[PDB]
Each structure stands twice: as C-alpha cells, then as structure tokens.
C-alpha cells in the first residue's frame, strides 16, 4: 500500500506556511476571473484535500492558479460563474479520462514555444488585470501599492524565513483600518466564505447545449492543468526522489476538480511556486498539502471579518509581483518559427484578452509547422509543350512556404523566351506563397524571360488574408 505519516512536525508547519501564502492567491485569482473569493478559497481547500488523498506526488500543492482562472474569465462574463462549475466538473472528467487511458507520456510532444508563450501571455494578462483597479484612482491606492512593492522587495533582505508579502498585507491592512483610508476593500469585490462548502450540483447548466459551450474550455483547462501538474511533479522529483506515476497524479487531479465543481468551486491545478516554497521549508508528506488546505479553510473562517477589511492595494501589489515573477524568460537575441509561435500567442492574448485563443493559435501554428517538418503538401511538375515552352504545374496546398525551396524547383540556368506558370491545381493560404511566386517571376523577368500565369485566381482565393 505504501502510505505514510513521516515527519508531521515539518509537514504541518510547511502546510501552514503555504496556506498563508495560499489565501491571497485564491482571493485575487477569484477577483481576476470576475467571481467571488469564496469560489477560489473553496477550490483551494477541496482540491488540496482530494489531491492530498489521491495525488501521485506527495508534497505538491494543488490549489487555485491564474493558469486556470484566466481561462474561465471569459466563460463567467458570457454564461456565468456557474457554467464555470460545469466546466470544472467536465474538466475533472477529462483528466480522469486522460489518466485512465495512460497518456501522460504524450505531454512531452507539446511544443516549448506554446508553453513559454502561454506563460508570458498569462503573466502580462495578470498585470493587465491589475489595471482596472487604477482607472478609479485615489492616491492612497498608488501610495499603498508603491509602498507594497517597496516593502515586498526591500524588507526580505533584512528579514528571514517569513514572507515579505505577509508583512505587506498585514501592515497595509492595519494602516488602512487605523488611518481609515478611502480605498476599495476585498469584501466589495465578492463574498468571502462563512461556512463549509456544501454539495452544489451544477443546477445552472443544462445537458447538451451546455456541453457544446463548456467542452472547449474544459479541454484547455484539463490540458493546462495536466501540463502544470506534470512539470511541478517532475520538479519535485528532481528536488528529491520518486517514481511518481503521473497518471495517478492526473487522476487525483481529475477527481479533485470534479468534486470541486460539485461543491461550488473553481478549477485548479499544481502550483510551481508554492510547491517549491513547501519542499524548501521541509514539506515532503501528504499531510503537508492536507494541512495546507485545511489550515487554509480554518484560517479564512477565523479571520473573515478581518479578511474583508484587507485593502485592494495590498493584493494588487502581490499580484503585481507574482506577474513579474511569472513573465521574465530568456528573451533570446534560434528557430524563427518557434519565436513566431510564442510572440503569436502573446500578442493575440494581449489584444483579445483571451488566453484560450492564444493557446488555440499556438496549437494550430505548432501543428502547421509540424506538417511542414513532416510532409510536402505541394509539388511542382515541369512539363514541355510541343512549342518548347516550359510550363511549371504547381499542385498542392501552399502555406508558410520557403522561397528557397520554391526557387530551387525552377530552372534558371538557361534564360528561355517565355515560361508558363500553372497554378490551376495550386492553393495559396498565406502571403508568403504570393511572395515566393513573386520572387520567382521577378527573377525570370530580371533575367529577360517573360512569364505567363495560368489558373491563378483559384489559387490566390484560399488566402487567409481574405479573413
């Protein structure tokens, strides 16, 4: 069976620490996803519990992260905070399906460009989510968020193994309460937990038409969650030693999200930062995560009236630094295509404020580049008419085409009089196809050889630029 209770003294303590670090995360992420803090705190609690009992890698905190929230933020403003519940249930179902089929090993196939793009987009979206707290601006907001960043970045060089964010929140709370500062408090953005999570059957979604609208977000949530769980797992593996079955971990994740959805909760996955803070502080048991969730619930129930008094500047500061911690990568001075994928995801997510779309275009772009690495999909065939005129029959789909490969398939050795270019069986899906053909024709014309284009409009009609 191999089930233990080793090192309770350190596991409990670690769980306490990461719980104190867990409260503001869940509250904030709840606000970011346009929902009550209650949902996030509940999520963190129940997920931590179920993962503590059914998780694969002990000492790994699974609660509520932005990686999940920013994928539901669009579902909640279009259908509600409850289509969210359905989506979390279905998400968990997809995860236990993924674990039952034993498919974790395939997570390696996921392009690094897509992932790093997801991270960047995520972080800058966090930072952008902190902006609507500045549109209605009192200078107390600015002063307390600036002093927040200040105390978070300048205090820990003097202090010890206790969070500077803890001191930030406590101090700013005490100040805001005593001085009676005029600023938005957390209790305004949503209701905070006052009791235990009750069994809430998603009474709000309805069968099929619901399925057709929650399936995509459940898919993306599931995949992102399993990726996060995988990498977090492996990092805990490297930090210590284990033969953790990532399939069992995925299953536990699934069940957790399922019952979470059935108890009015958000969607959750593994948390890198808090898992690291945990293992660093001595947490390596399941009791660590259990005590994390439990002490989280107990403490949020204990400090509730004090909790709702916490100024939004503190939490917006904490989010402001968590964003910074998340974004910064290797901004390389490398494969152009992969960079294209990352920047595509980033820019699209930034412009649309939809992380799911960035993920989507990342997937399809990676798929296209893959098809370009693995197959042909287009070939030219030089044919001679009795006139002695070279006619190049371009057949197939042309997207992201390389100009070099296109030029190499044409003969420029002997400048003929006239050359026919047949596009009757071709399809241009990108402006690069155009550009390539242009380089060819420009080369021929510069060489003194005239070009006759055939069956053209059909090929240039498949252009994506036609929207």
């Amino acid at each position, epitope marked *: 069976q191999r089930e233990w209770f080793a090192n309770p003294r350190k596991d409990v303590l670690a769980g306490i620490v990461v719980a104190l670090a867990l409260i503001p995360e869940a509250i904030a992420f709840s606000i970011i996803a346009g929902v009550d803090p209650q949902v996030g705190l509940y999520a963190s609690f129940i997920i931590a519990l179920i993962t503590a009992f059914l998780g694969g890698r002990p000492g790994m905190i699974s609660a509520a992260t932005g990686a999940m929230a920013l994928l539901m933020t669009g579902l909640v403003k279009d259908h509600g905070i409850q289509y969210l519940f359905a989506a979390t249930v279905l998400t968990g179902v997809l995860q236990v399906v993924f674990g039952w089929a034993k498919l974790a090993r395939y997570l390696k196939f996921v392009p690094r460009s897509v992932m790093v793009g997801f991270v960047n987009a995520l972080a800058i979206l966090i930072f952008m989510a902190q902006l609507p707290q500045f549109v209605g601006a009192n200078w107390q907001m600015y002063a307390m968020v600036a002093a927040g960043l200040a105390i978070i970045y300048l205090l820990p060089l003097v202090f010890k193994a206790m969070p500077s964010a803890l001191v930030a929140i406590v101090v700013l709370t005490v100040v805001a309460v005593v001085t009676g500062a005029d600023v938005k408090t957390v209790g305004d953005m949503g209701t905070l937990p006052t009791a235990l999570p009750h069994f809430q059957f998603p009474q709000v979604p309805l069968t099929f038409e619901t399925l057709a609208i929650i399936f995509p977000v459940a898919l993306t949530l599931s995949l992102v969650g399993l990726l996060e769980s995988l990498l977090t797992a492996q990092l805990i593996d490297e930090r210590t030693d284990t033969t953790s079955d990532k399939n069992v971990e995925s299953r536990g994740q699934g069940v957790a999200n399922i019952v979470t959805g059935f108890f009015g909760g958000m969607a959750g996955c593994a948390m890198i930062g808090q898992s690291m803070i945990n293992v660093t502080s001595g947490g390596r048991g399941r009791l660590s995560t259990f005590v994390a969730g439990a002490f989280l619930m107990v403490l949020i129930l204990a400090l509730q009236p004090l909790l709702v008094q916490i100024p939004m500047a503190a939490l917006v500061a904490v989010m402001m630094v968590v964003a910074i911690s998340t974004f910064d990568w290797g901004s390389l001075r490398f494969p152009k295509g992969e960079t294209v994928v990352m920047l595509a995801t980033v820019a699209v997510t930034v412009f649309t404020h939809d992380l799911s779309l960035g993920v989507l275009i990342g997937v399809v772009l990676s798929a296209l580049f893959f098809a370009r690495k693995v197959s042909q999909l287009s070939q030219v065939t030089p044919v001679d008419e009795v006139d002695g005129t070279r006619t190049y029959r371009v057949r197939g789909q042309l997207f992201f085409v390389s100009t070099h490969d296109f030029l190499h398939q044409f003969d420029f050795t002997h400048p003929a009089r006239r050359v026919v270019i047949d596009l009757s069986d071709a399809h241009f899906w990108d402006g690069s196809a*155009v550009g390539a053909l242009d380089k060819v024709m420009l080369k021929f*014309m*510069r*060489q*003194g050889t*005239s*070009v*006759e*284009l055939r069956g053209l409009n059909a090929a240039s009609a498949t252009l994506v630029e036609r929207l």
Partner: nanobody
Amino acid sequence: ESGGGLVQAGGSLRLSCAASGSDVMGWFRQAPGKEREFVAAVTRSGGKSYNADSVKGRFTISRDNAKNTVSLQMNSLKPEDTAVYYCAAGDTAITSWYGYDYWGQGTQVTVS
C-alpha cells in the same frame, strides 16, 4: 497615369502611366465592388508578366524609353474588362501583388 475612356464591342485603347514622383512597373484592374485583379508587369531588363486568366493573350505591356512611363495596350475588350485600371511603380519587389513603394489612383474603363 492617363488613357481612360469609353470603348465599344471590339474596340481598343492604350494606357500610358506617368510617374510624376525603379526596376519593375505593374498594372492591376479593379472590378467595381469585386476583388482587385492583376493585369501585367514589366521590368527594365525587358521581361514581361501577364495574367492569362484576365488577359487571354489580348493585352500587351511595355515600358517606354522615358524614365517615368509605362504603356498597356488593350485590344478586343469585353464586358468583364470593365474596371478601374491602377498603375503601380513598386520596385525590386512584389512584381505580382500587394504593391510596394508607389501607387497611382486609377482611372475608369468602361466597354460596350
């Protein structure tokens, strides 16, 4: 750009484009309300490029000896040639579409 006017059933018309402002010069035609279409393009070297879909071997492009002039001879016009003919002077690139450095507002060409 100059040469717009009215044409009959099998009539003809030459279109001289002047650049008042340099490898290659082009000509496109825009059907009213419909997607733009390529007509022809000619380089300094002497190489031509036609659109055998819109130009069924009827039209004839040539560059004048003058530095800022390109002529497009148009014969055997038909109801579907009725369009606005734009002259482009983009150089060293995009011989075929989407334009480059210079464009010129097009004139109307109507057949009957």
